[PDB]
Structure formats: structure tokens, C-alpha cells
Amino acid sequence: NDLGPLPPGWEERIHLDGRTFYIDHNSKITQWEDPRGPAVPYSREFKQKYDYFRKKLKKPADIPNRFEMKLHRNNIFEESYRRIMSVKRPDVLKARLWIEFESEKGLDYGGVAREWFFLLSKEMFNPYYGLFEYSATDNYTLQINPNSGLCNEDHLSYFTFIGRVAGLAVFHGKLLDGFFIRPFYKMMLGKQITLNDMESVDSEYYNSLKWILENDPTELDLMFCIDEENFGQTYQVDLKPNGSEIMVTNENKREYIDLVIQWRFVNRVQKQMNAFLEGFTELLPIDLIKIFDENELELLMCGLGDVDVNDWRQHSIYKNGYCPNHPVIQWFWKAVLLMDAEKRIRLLQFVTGTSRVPMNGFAELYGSNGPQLFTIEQWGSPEKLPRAHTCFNRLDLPPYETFEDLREKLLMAVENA
Amino acid sequence: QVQLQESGGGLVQAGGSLRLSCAASGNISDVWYMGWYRQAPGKEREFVAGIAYGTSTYYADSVKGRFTISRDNAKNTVYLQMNSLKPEDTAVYYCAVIITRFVSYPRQHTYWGQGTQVTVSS
Secondary structure (H helix, E strand, O other), rough: OOOOOOOOOOOEEEEOOOOOEEEEEEEEEEEEEOOOOOOOOOOOHHHHHHHHHHOOOOOOOOOOOOOEEEEEEHHHHHHHHHHHHHHOHHHHOOOEEEEEEEEHHHOOOOOHHHHHHHHHHHHHHOHHHOOOEEEOOOOOOOEOOOOHHHHOHHHHHHHHHHHHHHHHHHHHHOOOOOOEEEHHHHHHHHOOOOOOOOOOOOOOHHHHHHHHHHOOOOOOOOOOOOEEOOOOOOOOEEEEOOOOOOOOOOHHHHHHHHHHHHHHHHHHHHHHHHHHHHHHOOOOOOHHOOOOOOHHHHHHHOOOOOOOOHHHOOOOOEEEEOOOOOOHHHHHHHHHHOOOOOHHHHHHHHHHHOOOOOOOOOOOOOOOOOOOOOEEEEEEOOOOOOOOOOOEEEEOOOOOOHHHHHHHHHHHHOOOO | OOOEEEOOOEEEEEEEEEEEEEEEEEOOOOEEEEEEEEOOOOOOOEEEEEEOOOOOOEEOOOOOOOOEEEOOOOOOOOEEEEOOOOOOOOOOEEEEEEEEEEEOOEEEEEEEOOEEEEEEEE
């Protein structure tokens, strides 16, 4: 109505007293005044976020009621590309879509649209095509192949098609099967990529940059110039004006790390990510999705798959004196039991690093080096917040005096990514 | 090609404020780094401030706290404001830009300003 869309990253909620408050998720603050005080304590709830997001998604009435597609299962990717990118009005895709498979053969997954989304997600997110490549830490999470242009001549068009399909999945309530690294979702949100975010992108770059961050680079005799092995011929690039003859020292460290990350990761995938976002936003402006975090954005796109805590517990190995009968371990599992399904998935993302659970269960759970199981290691003083390592699926759980303290600390850590 | 000209540079008492503006002309497609450099009498050029990408701003430890670097997109002009100015600040202030141009492989083109003598009186 006359009020208009809320500013990006804002939400409106109804209090039990009936007065409506406004929550800024970027700063995590509640207020009474309309954006266009204490109010209620901030509570990041994915269910209410999703309800608000779906409510503010409005289907145009001018478009045809039904969006009809005919595809061949042998190569679903190609006909899907042709049909979806042949549409000049993206709003037509906002209309309900019924994908009549060839000869109505079947193979449904509870819905022909869901079956189409499943098979297409299998096809697009296969690194064989070259658009995407498996993450460094995991073997199932994906990322944009920086060399995607070399393999595919029209990689930008295919990335736009993938973005359009993802936008369709989010808009229509269906779910995609591909899980991306955290920097992927951060680049959707327009957030800043940090050194930790490189853990998924490349192990060599992350390890070298971490060494530089912690130790004095003066031993390495580093300049503000990096060598671009990619592209024909090997040549040096200055990260800052007069990069050569400028030496990386303790005062020039974080600037060097930021510039190296920008040149070697962000600059390389920026074009492909921009094409993906251009395809994605044709059905959902970024402002609506900016309320979600990267973790919540992953859940919104790939869905909230219920996690069986019994299988999770049985196929878990404890470390540093923790035992299944240990009071802290069973208290932690009690806290996991009482916590919601979305909170359980957020705990998975906090420790494992992704919401994907292997189809065989938690026995096949992987890691940076290889097959690695969920680990809960004793570490730190009781007061400290739990920490997580997603390269080895490790939760550094301090020994907690009582169940209530452990529950509160674990919830605070899970909520604060 | 891009050409830079720095103005706003004049002798000022120490503890005075100087703003240096880098007027940039030409096709500034995508600036990788907008920096202010300093050349003291008898010394090589040394980094003073940098805008780099987005809004991340990097300062030299000598000028950290005292100076502030900003960019105006409509004018594409960078302003370095120096406060608590000191004799060390007396050097000649250049303005450099790096434009990442993509022909075959993407490469960095560095364009340097003429410079303004900024001095401190005390």
C-alpha cells in the first residue's frame, strides 16, 4: 500500500500485545518507529523470516496462469536452458509452472515440478560441465569455477540460466539439490569475503595467507606484487600502485591479504556471480533476500532437511577425554534434542559447514582431508563460547558446569555464525 | 587513457588542515586502487593512503589517525584530508590509480599524478 517496500534487511513483526515492531537483521535491533528503543529483544527466527518473505512475494496477475514446459529426460539441462532463457518476460515464470515430461513417462518425486527441479539440480551442479567445481574442503559442496570461461564459451548465459532456475525454486517453494560454499551465499548477499572464507575456495591460498597473517612476512620477503599463472604467459601484477618495491610488513599485512583475496578469488568469479545474480533477481529483488544470512539463505534455497539426531549421535566420535556417557556429552545431545529442527540444521552448518547430510547418514560424513566423522572435543575454559572447525567437522565444546549454561552457550554460538 | 591532476596542496602551519583533490579525466572504467603517495625530500615514494576496492580504506602507520581518504564517484575524485599536519608531512603528494583493463589477460595500468608540494610551518 502507500507505505511501500521496507528498506533492505528490515522486517515487520507482530507482538503478542498487538503492536507491530520492526527488526533490522543487519544490526540485529528492534524498534517501534517505522523505518520509512528497546522494543522486543532481537530473535533471529527463520520460520518468521520465511513467513514474511513468502507473504511479500506477490505474483503478477497480467501473466498467463500456467507456464507449460515439455522436456526430454535424457538431456533435461539443454531443453530447460532453451525454454527458460527463451522467455523475454521473466514475470511469466512467476506463474504456476507445470512441466509436462515427454509422454508423461513419470518418475515423479511427489510432484512433476519437484522432479524437474531435482533432475535439473543434478545436471547443472555436475562439475563435468565446467560451470561449477567441487569445493576444497568437501566433495559435495560446489563453487563457481574461475576457469569456467575456458571450458564453456557462453558460461555467463548458463550462469544466468542457473540463477533463473534457482530464483524459480525459491519463488515457487520448490527446492534445489545443490549446496554451495559459504562465500557463494555471501556474494549473493553482497557481503565482504574474508580470509576464513577462502578455506573453501582453495587450500593453498588460504594456508599461505593464514601463515602471512599470523607470522611476520619479513622472512618471506614479500612484495605487493603477485604472479598470475593463469592466462597465456606468466606475468606479475601490482596490487597497489608501485606494488613492486613495496614490501609486505606487519603494517601492510591485512591490506595485502584483502587485495590478494580480491584479485585471486573475487575478481575471478565476479563476472559469473553477477550473471548468476542477474538471472536470480529477475524473479526476486535482492532486497527481499537480504534479510537472510548466508546460512539461512542456504536453508531457504536448498530447504530444511530434517536431521535424525539418533543417527547423528551414533556415528560420532568424541575427542580429548569426552565419552558418550560423559555428563557434558549427553547434556549436549539433550540440548540438541530439545532444540528446533532449524536450530539443529544451524548447528550442523556451524560445525559441519553445510546443511547437507550424506544420503547414507552420518557414517559417510566427509571433511577436508577425507572421510571424517562428527567430533566433539574438549577445549577452552567453561565461560568461552563453543567454536567450530568445518574442515574437520569439529566442535570445541568447553566443559560446562550445568545443563542450562551449556544450552545457553551452545544456542548463542549457533545463532551467532 | 586516464590523467590525474592533484590540487588543494599549499604550505600550512603544523597542526593545520590540508585537503588534496585528485581530479581524474578519461575512461575510469573500474579503479582497482585509488591511492595517495608521498615523496619526501631525498626519499623514495611511500604509501600514504589507499581506497582499493569498495569502501575498505588503508592508511600508512605514520599517517594513521591524522589523515582521511574519500572518493567522490560523480567526480571520481579522491580527497586526502591531513590534520595535525607535521614536518614529516612536508613531502610532495602524488595521487595514483590502478585501472584493471581486460584485453586477453586482465592487467593493471598505473596512472600517476603530477604532485603538490604540501609543507608544515612550526
